[PDB]
């Protein structure tokens, strides 16, 4: 009796699909039941702000499966951008590490070898805090709310030009990771050239005489330095990754949060 779940399945699916990827909820550390009951609870809350789903579309019919996939796509799309956001800083971490010679086993051997995700694992904490300190996830959920009124159920999805712009984000990530870390990269390289001068002085100094000592030191030090004004860049890139989600669900930006 009261088969309501049929009435609100699609919005819930869009919500939870956005959730299964979003950098805070859809990460690890959170068992799938938590995320599932979180998504199912959000619908009850936004139940007012959801237009009537297009009737006559039974779930157990091809017509329903097409659109259900057409919403899972939007959901994955919204979160994957935030994923790119935090991965910007992950790459910052892994660049500054592998430049410090800290991560070295996978730089000599790209094969199975050995990876050291430590500095990157730390900067991911930052990016998952910045997205939380400034309440990113709230804005991200509000965007999904507005989505039911900009990219409504049963009325279109992302277009081909949207996907292409979205898959460009990998270039954006490399660009951002350099825009942030250029100061430290250049300094570390100059210090490595200072090394090279002092070693050209005498060919005795080798990888197993003073191997990586100054490298480790300066790589950590310039990382601490980059840490100083790191929130500013995150604020800038949050604007881009926010307008981008505004591009998907058109929504006419510059109106609210």
């Amino acid at each position: 009796v009261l088969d309501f779940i049929a009435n609100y399945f699609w919005p819930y699916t869009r919500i939870a699909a956005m959730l299964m990827v979003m950098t805070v909820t859809g990460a690890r550390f959170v068992p799938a039941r938590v995320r599932l009951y979180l998504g199912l609870a959000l619908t009850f809350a936004v139940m007012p702000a959801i237009p009537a789903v297009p009737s006559d579309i039974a779930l157990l019919s091809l017509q329903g499966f097409m659109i259900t996939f057409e919403q899972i796509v939007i959901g994955m799309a919204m979160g994957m951008v935030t994923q790119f956001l935090v991965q910007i800083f992950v790459m910052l971490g892994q660049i500054l590490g592998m430049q410090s010679s800290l991560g070295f086993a996978s730089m000599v051997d790209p094969a199975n070898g050995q990876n050291t995700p430590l500095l990157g694992q730390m900067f991911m904490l930052l990016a998952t805090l910045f997205f939380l300190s400034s309440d990113g996830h709230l804005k991200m959920i509000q965007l999904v709310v507005f989505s039911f009124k900009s990219l409504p159920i049963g009325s279109g999805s992302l277009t081909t030009v949207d996907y292409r712009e979205l898959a460009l984000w990998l270039g954006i990530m490399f660009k951002a990771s350099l825009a942030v870390s250029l100061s430290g990269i250049i300094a570390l390289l100059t210090v490595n050239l200072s090394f090279g001068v002092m070693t050209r002085a005498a060919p005795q100094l080798n990888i197993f005489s003073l191997g990586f000592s100054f490298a480790l030191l300066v790589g950590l030090l310039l990382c601490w330095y980059i840490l100083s004004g790191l929130y500013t860049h995150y604020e800038i890139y949050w604007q881009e990754t926010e307008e981008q989600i505004c591009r998907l669900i058109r929504l006419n930006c510059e109106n609210l949060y």
Partner: protein
């Protein structure tokens, strides 16, 4: 389907903090997600005891002595659980979900439970990912230190996610860890 009730409590926070911890020090699939679900289901019974007391000694037993409508029991129990959450949810989360609900901005202690639940869980997740990542950070200091010391003498290969696990456990037990971590999580709930 009933597991929402337990997830209405301070359960999702302890689950998350413990999962960040298990992954903080090398350990993966050490004490199984079932084990941490257990430890959380116990710390929750320890924390929410006043709430369950308000429920039992005020609506439960008088319902076994019914003299009341069955839904009246939920109605009188919907209130104390609410009051517990309202001491935990952030104000920003509450007002933002009032906006998103479409309902007018009404006074707190007045919004329905349905808006309280996700506003509660998101505030809990915020608090938990902060607490854990600030407990996480130390266990990462050791990792960086030992990996740097390795790379110093070199050796390039001794996976520093195990050569550091002794130090991690020694340093986690030197502070007694759980009598500080499992306590602060119980002291982080004024209700």
């Amino acid at each position: 389907l009933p597991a929402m009730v337990i997830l209405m409590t301070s359960f999702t926070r302890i689950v998350v903090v413990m999962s960040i911890l298990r992954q903080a020090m090398g350990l993966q699939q050490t004490p199984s997600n079932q084990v941490i679900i257990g430890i959380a289901l116990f710390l929750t019974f320890f924390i929410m005891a006043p709430v369950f007391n308000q429920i039992n000694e005020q609506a439960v037993q008088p319902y076994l002595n019914e003299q009341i409508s069955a839904r009246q029991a939920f109605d009188l129990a919907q209130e104390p659980m609410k009051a517990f959450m309202l001491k935990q949810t952030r104000i920003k989360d509450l007002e933002t979900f009032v906006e998103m609900s479409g309902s007018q901005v009404t006074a707190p202690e007045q919004v329905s439970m349905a808006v309280l639940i996700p506003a509660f869980i998101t505030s809990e997740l915020k608090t938990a990912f902060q607490i854990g990542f600030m407990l996480f950070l130390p266990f990462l200091i050791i990792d960086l230190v030992v990996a740097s010391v390795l790379m110093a003498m070199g050796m390039m290969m001794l996976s520093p996610m195990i050569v550091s696990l002794p130090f991690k456990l020694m340093l986690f037990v030197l502070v007694d860890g759980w009598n500080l971590i499992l306590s602060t999580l119980a002291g982080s709930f004024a209700l």
